[PDB]
Amino acid sequence: RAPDQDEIQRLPGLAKQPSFRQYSGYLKGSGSKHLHYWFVESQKDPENSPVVLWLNGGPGCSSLDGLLTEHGPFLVQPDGVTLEYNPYSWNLIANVLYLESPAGVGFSYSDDKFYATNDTEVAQSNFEALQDFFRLFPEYKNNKLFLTGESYAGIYIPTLAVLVMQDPSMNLQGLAVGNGLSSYEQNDNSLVYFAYYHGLLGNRLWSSLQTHCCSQNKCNFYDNKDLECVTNLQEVARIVGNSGLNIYNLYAPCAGGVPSDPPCTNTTAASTYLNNPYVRKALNIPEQLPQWDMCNFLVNLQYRRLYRSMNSQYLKLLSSQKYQILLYNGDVDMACNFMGDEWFVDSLNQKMEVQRRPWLVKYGSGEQIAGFVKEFSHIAFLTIKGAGHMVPTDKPLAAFTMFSRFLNKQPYE
Amino acid sequence: RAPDQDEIQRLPGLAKQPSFRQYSGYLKGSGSKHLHYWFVESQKDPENSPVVLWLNGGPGCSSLDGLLTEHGPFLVQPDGVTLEYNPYSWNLIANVLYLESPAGVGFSYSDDKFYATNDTEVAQSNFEALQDFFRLFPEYKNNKLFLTGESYAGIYIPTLAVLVMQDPSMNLQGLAVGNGLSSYEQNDNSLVYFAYYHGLLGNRLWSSLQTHCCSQNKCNFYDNKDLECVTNLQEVARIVGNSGLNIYNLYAPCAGGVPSDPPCTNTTAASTYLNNPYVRKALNIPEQLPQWDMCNFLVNLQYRRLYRSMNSQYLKLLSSQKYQILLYNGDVDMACNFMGDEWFVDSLNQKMEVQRRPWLVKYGSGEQIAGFVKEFSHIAFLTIKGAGHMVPTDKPLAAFTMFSRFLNKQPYE
Ligand SMILES: *[C@@H]1O[C@H](CO)[C@@H](O[C@H]2O[C@H](CO)[C@@H](O)[C@H](O)[C@H]2NC(C)=O)[C@H](O)[C@H]1NC(C)=O
Ligand SMILES: *[C@@H]1O[C@H](CO)[C@@H](O[C@H]2O[C@H](CO)[C@@H](O)[C@H](O)[C@H]2NC(C)=O)[C@H](O)[C@H]1NC(C)=O
Ligand SMILES: *[C@@H]1O[C@H](CO)[C@@H](O[C@H]2O[C@H](CO)[C@@H](O)[C@H](O)[C@H]2NC(C)=O)[C@H](O)[C@H]1NC(C)=O
Ligand SMILES: *[C@@H]1O[C@H](CO)[C@@H](O[C@H]2O[C@H](CO)[C@@H](O)[C@H](O)[C@H]2NC(C)=O)[C@H](O)[C@H]1NC(C)=O
Ligand SMILES: O=C(O)C(CC1CCCCC1)C(=O)O
Numbered sequence: 001r002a003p004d005q006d007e008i009q010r011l012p013g014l015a016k017q018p019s020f021r022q023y024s025g026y027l028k029g030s031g032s033k034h035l036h037y038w039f040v041e042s043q044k045d046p047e048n049s050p051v052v053l054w055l056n057g058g059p060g061c062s063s064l065d066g067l068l069t070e071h072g073p074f075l076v077q078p079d080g081v082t083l084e085y086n087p088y089s090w091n092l093i094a095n096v097l098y099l100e101s102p103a104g105v106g107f108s109y110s111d112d113k114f115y116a117t118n119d120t121e122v123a124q125s126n127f128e129a130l131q132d133f134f135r136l137f138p139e140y141k142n143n144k145l146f147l148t149g150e151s152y153a154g155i156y157i158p159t160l161a162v163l164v165m166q167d168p169s170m171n172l173q174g175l176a177v178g179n180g181l182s183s184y185e186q187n188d189n190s191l192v193y194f195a196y197y198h199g200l201l202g203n204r205l206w207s208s209l210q211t212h213c214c215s216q217n218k219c220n221f222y223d224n225k226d227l228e229c230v231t232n233l234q235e236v237a238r239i240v241g242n243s244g245l246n247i248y249n250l251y252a253p254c255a256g257g258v259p260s261d262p263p264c265t266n267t268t269a270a271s272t273y274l275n276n277p278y279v280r281k282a283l284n285i286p287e288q289l290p291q292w293d294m295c296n297f298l299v300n301l302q303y304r305r306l307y308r309s310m311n312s313q314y315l316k317l318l319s320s321q322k323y324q325i326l327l328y329n330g331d332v333d334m335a336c337n338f339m340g341d342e343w344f345v346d347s348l349n350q351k352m353e354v355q356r357r358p359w360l361v362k363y364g365s366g367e368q369i370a371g372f373v374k375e376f377s378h379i380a381f382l383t384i385k386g387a388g389h390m391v392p393t394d395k396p397l398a399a400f401t402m403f404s405r406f407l408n409k410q411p412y413e
Numbered sequence: 414r415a416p417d418q419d420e421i422q423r424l425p426g427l428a429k430q431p432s433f434r435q436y437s438g439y440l441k442g443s444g445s446k447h448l449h450y451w452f453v454e455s456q457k458d459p460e461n462s463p464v465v466l467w468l469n470g471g472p473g474c475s476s477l478d479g480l481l482t483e484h485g486p487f488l489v490q491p492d493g494v495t496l497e498y499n500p501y502s503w504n505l506i507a508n509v510l511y512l513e514s515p516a517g518v519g520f521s522y523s524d525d526k527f528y529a530t531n532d533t534e535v536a537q538s539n540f541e542a543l544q545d546f547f548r549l550f551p552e553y554k555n556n557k558l559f560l561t562g563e564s565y566a567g568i569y570i571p572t573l574a575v576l577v578m579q580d581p582s583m584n585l586q587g588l589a590v591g592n593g594l595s596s597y598e599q600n601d602n603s604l605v606y607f608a609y610y611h612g613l614l615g616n617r618l619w620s621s622l623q624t625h626c627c628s629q630n631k632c633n634f635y636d637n638k639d640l641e642c643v644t645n646l647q648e649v650a651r652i653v654g655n656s657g658l659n660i661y662n663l664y665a666p667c668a669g670g671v672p673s674d675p676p677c678t679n680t681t682a683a684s685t686y687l688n689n690p691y692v693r694k695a696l697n698i699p700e701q702l703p704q705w706d707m708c709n710f711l712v713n714l715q716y717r718r719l720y721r722s723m724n725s726q727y728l729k730l731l732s733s734q735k736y737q738i739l740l741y742n743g744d745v746d747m748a749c750n751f752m753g754d755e756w757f758v759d760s761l762n763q764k765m766e767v768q769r770r771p772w773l774v775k776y777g778s779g780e781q782i783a784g785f786v787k788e789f790s791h792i793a794f795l796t797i798k799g800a801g802h803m804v805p806t807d808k809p810l811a812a813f814t815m816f817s818r819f820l821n822k823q824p825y826e
């Protein structure tokens with residue numbers, strides 16, 4: 001029914017024992033790949049709650065970021081020892097499968113330790129890992145399945161979904177992507193606008209960008225070869241990403257301060273926790289495996305990106321009208337800004353277009369605007385107002401509320 | 414030397430007695446106007462520290478907002494009883510004169526209770542009130558004088574400064590305006606851009622605005638008579654100001670929740686405190702005066718606005734090269750957004766233009782980018798990153814640091 005050998009018995013750092021069962025073990029990917037999973041059953045009706053895959057991006061970064069710092073049942077504290085229960089955990093209402101992927105990420109590995117990979121191989125290996133999951137957990141074969149993820153998983157998830165839709169044994173019902181990479185061109189073009197209108201660039205640089213990169217109403221900040229345009233865009237890149245601003249949340253401090261872990265981020269708490277030998281033992285991690293890192297340098301170094309846009313994947317997925325799709329963006333993220341993804345969804349040109357509206361969450365404090373939703377048939381784009389790249393870290397209530405409406409095919413408003 | 418009759422002896426709600434002397438009384442304005450002031454001496458070297466006038470805007474709102482909730486020596490707590498010392502108080506380094514203005518605002522009054530006024534009369538009455546201040550505090554006649562204020566005081570302060578510059582007995586050294594109204598046209602045009610690029614408007618409305626309000630690279634969202642443009646701008650106005658977003662800070666909650674005190678604000682703590690009869694007694698407020706309100710409805714109702722731009726005032730002030738000028742803007746404010754004021758300063762076309770740079774504040778956490786500065790001869794424009802309309806409330810350390818560099822004519826970086 002379920003793999004007892006993978007069950008987590010007593011997790012260090014928890015002051016109270018979980019109400020739900022949880023598992024940590026390995027799913028077989030392609031070739032000699034073994035992907036480490038951490039599966040947390042629904043706090044309410046695990047038997048009949050949906051199964052929800054969560055992937056973080058990178059490429060080369062760990063989905064345990066998602067668990068321990070974003071939307072897991074408990075979150076790691078700054079001491080790197082203590083875990084506290086998360087009242088906005090996505091596993092309140094779902095069986096959440098966190099998958100460290102591809103091979104070499106975190107506790108994932110391969111027998112030959114060859115971790116050079118690409119989008120197509122990653123998709124196929126994740127597909128095989130999911131098949132393995134259902135072999136290990138056959139009681140979950142008929143549950144509604146959602147595929148979800150963040151940023152670079154904007155590529156992982158639609159490409160995986162395209163494989164999954166071809167497998168009728170999998171009860172695929174939808175996908176959700178947070179601050180996802182959907183189109184390099186829409187992301188790059190929108191970012192330049194974002195930088196100016198958020199006060200990061202001045203008039204002089206904006207006038208120059210407009211003169212050199214744009215023709216009439218249309219700007220090309222993506223693959224323009226205009227000489228001064230390129231120079232200006234190099235300066236924009238410097239300001240946005242190389243000057244002490246936090247690219248993941250414009251209004252957050254840069255961890256470690258302005259320069260003389262990707263810049264401005266600090267993953268020490270998760271790393272401290274996960275590298276505890278007793279935590280590794282509780283997580284059923286083989287002793288022979290190397291130290292845990294949030295991101296694998298070699299995986300990212302050798303990663304070959306293949307897709308420049310997910311337009312074809314989303315159109316394929318929408319064609320069947322079987323799946324509900326959500327793209328959601330913290331609107332203070334600069335790594336994958338909200339506007340590029342809003343442009344992306346609009347450009348899919350789907351039917352039953354709805355007027356753009358605010359969506360609401362009840363705080364104390366009463367009802368507040370949590371962001372805006374633009375909906376079409378089978379697909380919605382949503383902002384999360386005041387959240388950066390890691391939406392559930394920044395606005396955990398709004399994130400949970402959105403996730404609940406998504407899972408239940410309820411209006412986002 | 415100083416008016417002992419106006420000195421505040423023991424202020425209710427303070428757990429420790431102030432290190433500095435403070436006064437509350439009346440300055441004579443024009444006609445039968447009596448403007449209530451609260452003057453707080455520098456915590457360090459009051460004798461030789463600058464004198465700094467602070468005005469809040471409205472028109473019709475109280476500068477005691479500035480004291481009790483923004484940058485005063487102590488701030489009112491949610492109980493509306495307790496005052497706590499402010500470690501980032503502007504009176505750490507300056508003698509700060511908070512002036513309730515014009516007549517009818519807060520504890521200010523006139524013998525005939527006729528409060529209909531206009532920009533020119535307000536400027537002349539404030540000028541006479543300052544003359545009265547120096548008659549009452551002749552020991553401060555030679556101190557460096559700065560005139561400062563917020564939002565609508567973007568009109569109050571440059572118009573007053575123009576009067577003050579003609580009075581050689583006043584040691585005028587500079588002016589600073591926070592989220593100031595400097596040009597209706599630059600504010601209105603920039604706001605529409607701000608709304609779109611902060612995710613408040615969608616593609617459909619943006620495309621329409623561009624088609625109907627704009628010609629080539631130039632948009633007119635100020636006095637355009639294009640029919641569909643006007644309709645679109647009515648929808649923008651609704652979204653920005655009439656839909657449950659906090660216009661003063663886009664990422665803050667709306668006090669009292671989304672609709673079925675100006676909307677989204679809550680002034681109950683200051684009002685509770687100030688309406689305490691014992692606080693009124695300590696502040697030397699005549700018992701006959703009506704209840705204290707943050708803003709006077711009648712003053713605002715009957716107020717006649719006369720200036721549509723401060724361009725001429727700032728050019729007059731810059732012409733002498735005697736005064737240092739600062740315009741600073743919280744960059745998440747929508748009431749007087751940063752970009753309109755940056756456009757405003759740039760359009761003054763001053764000499765010794767400096768490249769736009771980040772400016773820094775030391776937190777724990779190390780050095781962080783606090784915003785960006787665009788400087789010219791005798792005038793700088795600065796953003797405060799992540800602050801709304803009330804900059805010192807939202808980012809008190811950054812505000813104090815900026816204020817200190819301003820007062821001392823130090824680089825903003
Ligand atoms: C990165 O995060 C780590 C872990 O959260 C921080 O380390 C410390 O944080 C607190 C402040 O001293 C202490 O209470 C913790 O005990 C301590 N945690 C650990 C595991 O050492 C660290 O300060 C952060 N670094 C930066 C520059 O932000
Ligand atoms: C993505 O990676 C896969 C797997 O390494 C590549 O697929 C092929 O690569 C090998 C080297 O040429 C072949 O020997 C394998 O048979 C073949 N594997 C499969 C299952 O197709 C693929 O070429 C890579 N894609 C790109 C564009 O680099
Ligand atoms: C407006 O502000 C007032 C005063 O700060 C709030 O009133 C209360 O706030 C706290 C929560 O109940 C209490 O601890 C205070 O005692 C109480 N203060 C006073 C003076 O009554 C009030 O909740 C606010 N209103 C809204 C809708 O935000
Ligand atoms: C602004 O207000 C002032 C004062 O009320 C106006 O100034 C004049 O108004 C009165 C009515 O006409 C005259 O009788 C006063 O003598 C005169 N006061 C002074 C000192 O000039 C002024 O007209 C108003 N400005 C506008 C445009 O309405
Ligand atoms: O958000 C993600 O999943 C990563 C970045 C994230 C990985 C874990 C550590 C923090 C950065 C991406 O942008 O692809």
Ligand SMILES: O=C(O)C(CC1CCCCC1)C(=O)O
Pocket residue numbers: 468469470471472474475478563564565566675678680707748802
């Ligand atoms: O910021 C100000 O001074 C006012 C608004 C403010 C007055 C006091 C109460 C809060 C709003 C303005 O915008 O002119």
